[PDB]
């Protein structure tokens, strides 16, 4: 009986794993767009 | 009485053995020794020593009867390739794959 209950509905979200597969929809560049300063890690812009 | 007899780590490319090996498949053991004697390869004298050993294993262990005997199955496979360094021009290096062979001769009356 140490493991019997489940968590509440919606409490424990799965979250974006990302960078895994074409079928997922989060593959290839992975939510960062084609080229640009948004992609290529280390860039971005200050506040 | 299958009496399989083989050789391992023979010094050959494995392609040149098949030129000799494909001719002897189906023929008699009496005729097979006569072909390998006068046919000239380095693998011919190697397969001759395996073929004479294959007949010799049938004589001692099994019930002999070398008057009528055919070779049913014969085949050769590639062995562990000895890797060396061959000096080529302009500082380039060749892998120089020295191949070995596994000669196998299954000789049986039935």
């Amino acid at each position: 009986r140490l493991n019997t209950l489940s968590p509440a509905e919606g409490s424990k979200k799965a979250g974006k794993r990302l960078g895994r597969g074409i079928g997922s929809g989060l593959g290839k560049t992975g939510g960062r767009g084609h080229k640009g300063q948004k992609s290529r890690s280390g860039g971005g812009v200050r506040r | 009485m299958e009496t399989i007899a083989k050789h391992r780590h023979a010094r050959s490319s494995a392609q040149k053995v098949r030129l000799v090996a494909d001719l002897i498949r189906g023929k008699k053991v009496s005729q097979a020794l006569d072909i390998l004697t006068y046919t000239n390869k380095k693998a011919a004298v190697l397969v001759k020593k395996v073929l004479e050993s294959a007949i010799a294993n049938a004589e001692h262990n099994d019930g002999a009867d070398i008057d009528d005997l055919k070779v049913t199955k014969i085949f050769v496979d590639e062995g562990p390739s000895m890797k060396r360094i061959m000096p080529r021009a302009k500082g380039r290096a060749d892998r120089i794959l020295k191949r070995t062979s596994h000669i196998t001769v299954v000789v049986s009356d039935r």
Binding site: - | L19, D34, Y38, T39
Partner: protein, 56 residues
């Protein structure tokens, strides 16, 4: 003189069709004893067409 693609095992094998050897079939015998030898060649013992040649 550089290949743009890799040839197949079929293309390799069909090239090796004509590299296959032929059988002997010219093995003859001496008139005195057996002695299996090639046509127009001396035996291991030295007998050629019945006549003794190279007694060494």
């Amino acid at each position: 003189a550089v290949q743009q693609n890799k040839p197949t095992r079929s293309k390799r094998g069909m090239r090796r069709s004509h590299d296959a050897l032929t059988a002997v079939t010219s093995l003859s015998v001496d008139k005195t004893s057996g002695e299996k030898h090639l046509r127009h060649h001396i035996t291991a013992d030295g007998y050629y067409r019945g006549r003794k040649v190279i007694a060494k």
